[PDB]
Ligand binder design. Structure first.
Ligand SMILES: CCC1=C(C)/C(=C/C2=NC(=C\c3[nH]c(/C=C4\NC(=O)[C@H](C)[C@H]4CC)c(C)c3CCC(=O)O)/C(CCC(=O)O)=C2C)NC1=O
Ligand SMILES: CCC1=C(C)/C(=C/C2=NC(=C\c3[nH]c(/C=C4\NC(=O)[C@H](C)[C@H]4CC)c(C)c3CCC(=O)O)/C(CCC(=O)O)=C2C)NC1=O
Ligand SMILES: CCC1=C(C)/C(=C/C2=NC(=C\c3[nH]c(/C=C4\NC(=O)[C@H](C)[C@H]4CC)c(C)c3CCC(=O)O)/C(CCC(=O)O)=C2C)NC1=O
Ligand SMILES: CCC1=C(C)/C(=C/C2=NC(=C\c3[nH]c(/C=C4\NC(=O)[C@H](C)[C@H]4CC)c(C)c3CCC(=O)O)/C(CCC(=O)O)=C2C)NC1=O
Ligand SMILES: CCC1=C(C)/C(=C/C2=NC(=C\c3[nH]c(/C=C4\NC(=O)[C@H](C)[C@H]4CC)c(C)c3CCC(=O)O)/C(CCC(=O)O)=C2C)NC1=O
Ligand SMILES: CCC1=C(C)/C(=C/C2=NC(=C\c3[nH]c(/C=C4\NC(=O)[C@H](C)[C@H]4CC)c(C)c3CCC(=O)O)/C(CCC(=O)O)=C2C)NC1=O
Ligand SMILES: CCC1=C(C)/C(=C/C2=NC(=C\c3[nH]c(/C=C4\NC(=O)[C@H](C)[C@H]4CC)c(C)c3CCC(=O)O)/C(CCC(=O)O)=C2C)NC1=O
Ligand SMILES: CCC1=C(C)/C(=C/C2=NC(=C\c3[nH]c(/C=C4\NC(=O)[C@H](C)[C@H]4CC)c(C)c3CCC(=O)O)/C(CCC(=O)O)=C2C)NC1=O
Ligand SMILES: CCC1=C(C)/C(=C/C2=NC(=C\c3[nH]c(/C=C4\NC(=O)[C@H](C)[C@H]4CC)c(C)c3CCC(=O)O)/C(CCC(=O)O)=C2C)NC1=O
Ligand SMILES: CCC1=C(C)/C(=C/C2=NC(=C\c3[nH]c(/C=C4\NC(=O)[C@H](C)[C@H]4CC)c(C)c3CCC(=O)O)/C(CCC(=O)O)=C2C)NC1=O
Ligand SMILES: CCC1=C(C)/C(=C/C2=NC(=C\c3[nH]c(/C=C4\NC(=O)[C@H](C)[C@H]4CC)c(C)c3CCC(=O)O)/C(CCC(=O)O)=C2C)NC1=O
Lengths: 57, 138, 172, 162, 162, 162, 172, 173, 162
């Protein structure tokens, strides 16, 4: 869902939130393209998880 | 670009498994009849099974899908569409009439595609449903 | 979203007959005049930003309380609000001349316009004094011949100005 | 609905920008082909009554059981043959509609939208209608580039059938 | 990036369907204007060095204070005039790029994306660059329909400036 | 709109909880600061007419071409100079408004919201208004901690200009 | 998404020079050879559904355990799964011939396809036996000497078949 | 996460589970006493916030001039506005660190995943920390200058204001 | 021929003296005037086929009898209209000649010497070419700079006709 193919893989370590209903599984990848990557890193840091790796695709 | 005008919020009362999830996403947005045969997209179905594309990402495609635009965006007025858009993803009818009107001017400038992206971006929407959960009535 | 090509289909579907030969001779003139239509459209969009402020040199100079303290075009966001959608009139009028039928314009641009303009508190009649000032500048650019082969696009000029008059009628 | 003039609009509207030369360029292309597309519309409208009864008796040839088996779906009864020329006569309307529109829009919105839902319920096999459309694309008598023009939209209805 | 061949793809890709005749109509249309667009590219490439120094000394005429006021931003000493022919010479590159692409894409992605952010920070008034581009569109010496072709993209950069 | 009393409310409202002692502390801070902020409001209101014509003739010094070049945008004739004291006189209003509010809210909502959109269209260079505000922050004659108080909001309008 | 027109821009931007005259003579042949691309493209999409089942029978008749009980094309949604994306090869190969460069092909069919085909357990090499059977039927339709006019499509036919060979290399 | 000087001396004191000692309260009493200086000083950074970034961009690009020359990753115009979009975000979070008084709010936003994107995008990571040092040379020049302000030693704040820039340069380079 | 370079030369020749600073300053007045003029000639050479088509049709609509009256002098036959585009096609050369030369030399030597001498004989009314040039004066499309210099030569030819 990105106008162009510019997708970077993201790996978060440990996501703290309401842990049963809101984040059922931490340490999972989120596949966000180039346009919202500015927005996505601010979304992850609001929960408090830290990024491991960011791999393009 | 410019910050949204402040609108008053009216008080509100509200304030096999894999296959089913796909249907649920389709059902809220298309109200059953619309999916038909033609509206369904092979790529979206594959991504979910594949899991390359997230559900939050999945819905955006449906919202921005060409079939959806002809059925709702073209026929309905911009103001009606904003109200119409709210029921399927947010699951709640807008509390304030003025607020709905404010959303409509923004929709016109960025187009149908632009408005849908904005809803996902808003903090209230993501928090209420979550990426994993399909949109539901509130 | 309808067209000249698609609207003569849509009523022809409602009566359920094949398209007649004089409707195809009508559409053959639409194709024939298509090149002229394209030229007019490109001149409006290339002078699109120059029209809006030159309309805003008169939309506010003629009714000068609007930007004076108290008027609804007073503060700076409010001023940028009637340039953010003075151009949306031009954004959809140019869509109407491209499609050749005002059905695209009616659905989004003017369907709910007269309702918000009493909900917000803005003067609705003070829009259509300046959309007429856009039409006075739009048909002045579209008719003038600069570096262009001589041709007669008079029919377009009158029904280009009909789209502005529809754009002023549903706001006032 | 889908039209090259419409597709220029809905692309430029969702971006919120004006009509660039890339949307405008697309419109220019349509005109060159729309001159040869309206040639294909008169070729099908004038030969309309020959083509319908040319088609609905060609499908009876390859499927002789359709006039013999007693069923509501079957055209063996006169009432079926009355609904035969209605249905095949509906196809040449929408093919001629999508000719003058230049796009597949009227074909996409009137004919093939939800066609898999209706043919499963009424048990109308889609192998019947594809046999009539192969008769139309070979017997319209059209020539030149206009013969290519009707041949796309007929074949576009064929692929949506199967 | 925005191109009439690309715009046919990204429209048909988001719909998950094949290339219809409505996406395929544009390609045929595009070649006819692309034949006259490449005429406009050679007209600007051959007259490139006359047009740059024709422009960067025309902006010094209407704005004589830009060569006099001592500022990093202004073109007072030779370092500004060295960055003068760089910046105006960057414009004729992207205008010639968007000519052969047929769309406004390279103009949209290289030049005007985020131009309001950069001109506010470095205090470069956009009234300077629009004065150079009016000199280019009047002094390229191009004629015919190719003279229309460069005149859209120059004027498209003008509207994005203001 | 942005105010330290408002910012305590909108923080505690989105959590759905009451006013804690943390929300209260922001409000508490305003009273000590607000005692010295209202000192800065009377210092600008009493010297208002000296400061406006002190500013609009200081910008004519550094930019002498603005009174000479004939254009609607420039202040060549008396109509520009009439709109000169209107615009610079609008700035001292909103600066005095954001003084007594304690926050940047009235400055954020009346003045700088959408300022990049308007200065691009009317070609008003933002280097003009920042030259007037540097004259105001050096010639208001304010002293003590109140001299710090007006100096933030003037400089906050400077950074939003560039 | 790149093109023939846009890729000769993109390397020309990386070196930062104006476009040379022999690159414009190259693109002038692309416009001249442009009409042929459309003719080839429309014949593939009009026979798009006829290729897949004809390609498909060979695909299952040659390796007959695949639909026999145990194979990964056995049950009915599994069978409809290798017709739902046998055509996506044709959906993006036709995008590649339209664009004229395989840079739009390698993001969708060639990017992560060899990764899913291992985890999934579906044979990867049993795809590229039948994508070759598509190419044998695709260039037979595109090069058929019927209708239109006689012309040289050999250059297009060989690099139409190069897109299928790239489509078979990254799966096998 | 968001910590402070006041809250971090709580958080380790919770982990040991004892009451706060009197010499920790004498430590925090100096923080309240030295607290006023930080606010006045930090107001000077934010008031000259936009003036720092371009004056750092007169040297970040003049020293490594291929970056804006054709080919570099700061070449085109949205690429150029991209390294002003987030040159200031360094200043947006360094000023949050001086306000909080502890770099624990700095390391979640500029230091957490920034070195990962800067090899995913293709931007030179080391060419950032040549100019964040040029920000620090201009930031402590403004924060120290005593203009129309009562004079008191500001040494403790300045040394560890520059420590936040050095942490901001270490996790990018 | 007359050129303000050679005007400085032939004046210094009759006095029999060297090129002092009196004749030398006449040269750079010609030099920096060419920048405006050269562009001003490029606006006419690019629009060559437009103006001779425009001025010829403007003559017929102004004087409707000149297409109907039988005579060699008029444009009733085809060879009259063939000689029509030759004549105004000959005017635009000398205007581009006298713009490039920078003086009224080629207008003197090639057009207006004996121009009132021939029109008495062939009964060609000079008011025909007055309205022909006045169409070029309004429709050449050049505004400012060189165009003002360019226009004078149109008005210098009109006063020579009358
Ligand atoms: C049905 C599958 C499933 C499980 C099991 C599940 C568990 C689960 N336990 C969590 C946290 C947690 N789970 C524990 C559990 C324990 N800590 C101890 O010391 C104890 C020995 C132990 C309980 C006996 C704790 C302490 C946390 C909070 C961790 C934190 O806040 O950092 C979280 C995330 C944090 C949260 O939202 O609370 C998840 C997802 N989520 C699921 O979807
Ligand atoms: C922020 C403004 C705001 C308000 C006030 C609000 C009210 C609100 N009250 C509700 C129900 C209710 N409210 C009451 C209230 C009362 N019963 C009594 O006897 C008393 C007289 C009275 C309270 C003093 C009851 C009994 C229900 C449940 C009714 C039912 O489920 O049938 C509901 C539906 C269920 C829910 O709580 O989600 C809403 C949304 N929503 C808002 O957004
Ligand atoms: C696509 C067709 C379309 C149009 C044209 C449209 C207009 C429109 N203009 C609005 C407000 C506005 N409209 C204006 C415009 C004006 N007020 C003035 O003072 C001037 C006289 C005049 C301009 C000449 C202003 C300043 C606002 C903001 C008013 C407010 O926020 O209360 C609003 C309500 C709030 C909004 O979303 O921004 C709508 C819906 N909406 C549409 O969907
Ligand atoms: C989408 C990109 C595009 C554009 C812009 C375009 C315009 C365009 N306008 C044309 C003609 C023309 N255009 C005009 C237009 C006018 N003349 C007047 O005096 C009127 C004031 C005005 C109409 C209001 C005329 C009169 C012609 C004469 C030739 C014809 O009938 O097409 C032609 C004919 C072919 C050529 O000029 O080479 C082109 C190309 N073609 C394209 O492919
Ligand atoms: C406007 C485009 C359009 C078309 C073409 C169309 C066809 C169509 N034909 C139908 C039935 C039918 N279609 C046929 C036609 C045939 N069966 C035969 O035996 C012959 C082989 C063949 C004709 C050559 C018959 C006989 C029925 C009635 C079957 C039944 O009632 O079960 C039905 C379901 C019931 C109905 O409303 O009548 C539809 C929807 N609908 C559309 O909206
Ligand atoms: C590839 C397309 C492209 C262009 C054109 C471009 C221009 C551009 N010119 C700039 C500065 C500049 N631009 C100019 C140019 C001018 N100033 C004047 O005084 C003259 C009026 C005028 C030239 C005619 C100067 C002198 C600077 C340096 C100003 C400064 O350092 O503050 C800057 C900011 C700093 C920089 O990296 O050098 C950009 C981004 N960037 C792009 O990516
Ligand atoms: C309430 C806050 C507020 C302010 C401050 C404001 C300013 C403002 N000044 C404007 C024009 C103008 N602004 C000026 C002012 C100046 N130009 C010069 O030459 C001088 C350097 C400078 C004054 C020192 C002039 C002369 C015009 C008219 C320019 C034109 O008409 O093109 C315009 C556009 C046209 C208008 O309505 O008059 C706005 C919106 N608008 C607002 O809503
Ligand atoms: C040789 C005969 C044969 C075929 C044809 C075949 C295809 C095939 N593709 C599959 C999956 C898939 N195939 C695709 C392909 C794509 N999805 C997209 O959105 C992309 C555009 C496109 C690639 C370019 C995807 C995404 C899956 C998901 C499941 C998986 O990873 O295998 C699977 C998994 C099992 C199943 O579907 O029942 C099958 C069977 N298997 C066979 O035995
Ligand atoms: C068997 C090998 C072979 C091929 C492939 C072939 C194709 C072919 N297509 C042609 C024309 C053409 N082909 C098309 C096709 C289209 N234009 C569109 O915009 C539509 C989307 C599309 C149809 C769906 C068109 C419009 C022309 C114009 C010339 C003509 O009418 O033939 C011509 C005319 C002569 C030439 O181009 O040199 C050739 C050669 N000729 C051959 O000998
Ligand atoms: C709040 C913490 C945070 C940061 C810092 C952040 C940075 C960030 N920088 C980006 C791009 C970028 N950033 C730069 C930066 C630079 N180029 C240079 O040469 C210089 C050394 C430097 C500027 C000082 C450039 C050029 C790009 C775009 C590169 C490209 O797209 O090709 C992107 C890509 C997409 C987007 O911006 O929306 C992100 C997400 N995101 C975050 O969440
Ligand atoms: C150049 C190095 C240097 C610095 C940085 C400096 C700052 C400084 N700020 C002071 C006071 C102060 N500074 C502030 C500042 C503020 N309070 C607020 O609540 C506002 C938000 C903010 C202004 C925006 C205040 C309120 C005081 C009280 C004492 C006074 O009036 O000076 C004092 C008084 C003496 C002292 O604190 O020991 C010093 C030293 N002195 C120096 O020599």
């Amino acid at each position: 869902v990105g106008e162009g193919d510019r997708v970077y893989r993201l790996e978060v370590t440990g996501i703290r939130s309401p842990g049963y209903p809101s984040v059922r599984r931490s340490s999972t990848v989120f596949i966000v393209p180039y346009e919202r990557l500015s927005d996505k890193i601010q979304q992850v840091h609001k929960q408090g998880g830290k990024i491991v790796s960011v791999t393009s695709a | 670009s410019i910050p949204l005008l402040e609108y008053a919020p009216s008080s509100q009362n509200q304030r096999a498994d894999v296959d089913a999830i796909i249907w649920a996403g389709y059902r809220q947005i298309f109200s059953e009849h619309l999916i038909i045969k033609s509206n369904r997209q092979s790529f979206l179905e594959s991504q979910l099974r594949n899991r390359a594309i997230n559900v939050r990402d999945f819905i955006r495609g449906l919202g921005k899908s060409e079939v959806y635009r002809t059925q709702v965006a073209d026929l309905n007025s911009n103001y009606r569409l904003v109200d119409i858009t709210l029921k399927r993803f947010l699951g709640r009818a807008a509390y304030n009439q003025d607020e709905e009107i404010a959303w409509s001017i923004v929709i016109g400038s960025q187009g149908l595609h632009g408005f849908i992206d904005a809803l996902l971006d808003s903090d209230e929407y993501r928090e209420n449903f979550g990426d994993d959960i399909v949109p539901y009535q509130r | 979203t309808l067209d000249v090509f698609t609207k003569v289909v849509s009523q022809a579907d409602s009566r359920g007959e094949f398209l007649s030969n004089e409707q195809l001779d009508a559409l053959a003139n639409v194709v024939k005049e298509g090149n002229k239509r394209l030229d007019v459209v490109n001149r409006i969009t290339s002078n699109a930003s120059a029209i809006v402020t030159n309309a805003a040199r008169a939309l506010f100079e003629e009714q000068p309380q609007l930007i004076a303290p108290g008027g609804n075009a007073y503060t700076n966001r409010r001023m940028a609000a009637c340039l953010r959608d003075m151009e949306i009139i031009l954004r959809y009028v140019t869509y109407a001349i491209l499609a050749g039928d005002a059905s695209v314009l009616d659905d989004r641009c003017l369907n709910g316009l007269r309702e918000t303009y009493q909900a917000l508190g803005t003067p609705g009649s003070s829009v259509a004094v300046g959309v007429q000032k856009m039409k006075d500048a739009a048909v002045g650019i579209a008719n003038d011949p600069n570096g262009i082969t001589k041709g007669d696009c008079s029919q377009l000029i009158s029904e280009v100005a009909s789209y502005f008059d529809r754009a002023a009628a549903a706001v006032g | 609905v889908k039209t090259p003039i419409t597709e220029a609009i809905a692309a430029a509207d969702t971006q919120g920008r004006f009509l660039g030369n890339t949307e405008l360029q697309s419109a220019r292309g349509r005109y060159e082909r729309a001159a040869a597309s309206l040639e294909a519309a008169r070729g099908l409208t004038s030969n309309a009554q020959r083509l319908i009864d040319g088609a609905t008796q060609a499908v009876y040839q390859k499927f002789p059981y359709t006039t013999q088996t007693p069923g509501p779906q079957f055209a063996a009864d006169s009432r079926g043959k009355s609904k035969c020329a209605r249905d095949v006569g509906h196809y040449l309307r929408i093919i001629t509609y999508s000719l003058v529109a230049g796009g597949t829009g009227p074909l996409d919105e009137y004919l093939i939208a939800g066609l898999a839902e209706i043919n499963s319920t009424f048990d109308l096999s889609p192998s019947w209608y594809v046999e009539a459309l192969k008769h139309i694309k070979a017997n319209h008598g059209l020539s030149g580039q206009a013969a290519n023009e009707a041949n796309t939209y007929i074949d576009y209805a064929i692929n949506a059938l199967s």
